[PDB]
Structure 1
Amino acid sequence: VGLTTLFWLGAIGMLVGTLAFAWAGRYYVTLVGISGIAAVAYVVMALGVGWVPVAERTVFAPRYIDWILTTPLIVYFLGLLAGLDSREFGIVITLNTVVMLAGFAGAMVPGIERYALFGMGAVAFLGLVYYLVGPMTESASQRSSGIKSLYVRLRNLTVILWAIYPFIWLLGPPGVALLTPTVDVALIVYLDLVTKVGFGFIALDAA
């Protein structure tokens, strides 16, 4: 099982999700963007494009462009469910972008300064979790019982799984380089598929 095989698997999974969401169908267009963008990133990586050598590790640049564009769309989807005003959107999307940019920069820096960048993303992530579990949950409470229930289920899926990524990053090549690239990639392909396509199908089921 090679890296390219794992990338192709993620590509296929994102494509199936993309077509499913497009067929079912603001919410549906967002889900198409979430999995559609990831599909492209995985194909590019499957073709061997964007594999950037950094010191002694290999960094996958399309992954971070993907995350920077798709994760704010996931937060946007959750913000619509919760009924956020256009100002609360700005805070959480700003916090999200800090996490994503810090990870991208830390991965691309060869020296230990990269752990300083990782730490900053961790701090901003804790602030993002606070807004999901607190203010956004208060806001979602004002909606119908079914919408509130859908928000809580997507929120917990999001919080629990997103919290695993920084550990995979740190244990993988970008960090202490403990986990091997193949295992590290396999774990992230699984998480990407669940936080995007699984996320989407839970929404379809409730609709």
Structure 2
Amino acid sequence: VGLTTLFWLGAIGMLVGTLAFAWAGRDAGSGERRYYVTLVGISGIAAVAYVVMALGVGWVPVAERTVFAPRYIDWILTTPLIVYFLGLLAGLDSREFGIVITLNTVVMLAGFAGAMVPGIERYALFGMGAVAFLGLVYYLVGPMTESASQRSSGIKSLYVRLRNLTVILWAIYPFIWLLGPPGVALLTPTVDVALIVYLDLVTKVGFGFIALDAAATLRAE
């Protein structure tokens, strides 16, 4: 299996999610619309990024490795949308949204910058991202969880489930960064890409399907 084949699989998986989220949302009132639209943006952006890589664009040589710019650009655009979706469920205000989106953006910017740095100092950038990520996790399991606990049962339950998916799975990405091409390159480029396709699909499309399943249930009682 070649890299471009894996990228095409990523694009198709994301498209399938996008179509599912769009159509599920056709049944949505003023209160639910923004959630469905957010899911469409998340998987739609990812679908296009995967197409870009599958078409052989954005493969950046860095020293003796290859870094995929569209991967990191996707994350910069889509992870704050996931954080936004979570913050909506939690019932955050603008100031709270600003904090978590900022922490999120620092992680993705640092990780992208580090991947693009040839020298050993790329690990300093990783480190900056890792600290910001611990801050984001704190916000997710602390303050945001406290905010979510004030909302309805169905909403609190969805928040916790999506929060758990997000915290556990997002924590795997930095290990793939460290062990893969940007770090010590113990994972082959193929295994690196395959792991990220699966992980992206679960954190975006799996996340969305969990939300779709909960939304149908709340509306049907």
Q: TM-score, normalised by structure 1?
A: 0.98
Residue 191 of structure 1: which of 195, 199, 204 is its match? Answer: 199
Identical residues among aligned pairs (%): 100
Deviation at 1:6? Answer: 0.3
Return the alpha-carbon distance in structure 1 between the equivalents of residues 110 and 145 of structure 2. 26
Deviation at 1:24? Answer: 1.1
Is the partner of 2:85 in helix, strand or coil? Answer: helix
Is the partner of 1:48 in helix, strand or coil? Answer: coil
Q: Deviations over 1:45-77 (max 9, x none)?
A: 001000010100000000011000000000000
Deviation at 1:189? Answer: 0.4
Q: Deviations over 1:19-60 (max 9, x none)?
A: 111111190000000000000000000010000101000000
Which 4+ stretches in 1 moved above 3 angstroms? none
Return the alpha-carbon distance in structure 2 between the equivalents of residues 76 and 21 of structure 1. 17
Return the alpha-carbon distance in structure 2 between the equivalents of residues 155 and 81 of structure 1. 10
Residue 52 of structure 2: which of 44, 50, 68 is its match? Answer: 44
Which structure 1 segments of 5+ residues have no match?
A: none
Is the partner of 2:67 in helix, strand or coil? Answer: strand
Which structure 2 segments of 5+ residues have no match?
A: 27-34, 214-219
Residues paired across the two proteins, number: 207
Is the partner of 1:59 in helix, strand or coil? Answer: strand
Is the partner of 1:120 in helix, strand or coil? Answer: helix
Residue 24 of structure 1 corresponds to 24
CA RMSD of aligned residues (A): 1.3
Deviation at 1:138? Answer: 0.3
Deviation at 1:79? Answer: 0.2
Q: Deviations over 1:140-197 (max 9, x none)?
A: 0110011000000000000000000000110001001111100111001000000000
Q: TM-score, normalised by structure 2?
A: 0.92
Deviation at 1:133? Answer: 0.2
1:128 aligns with 2:133: no
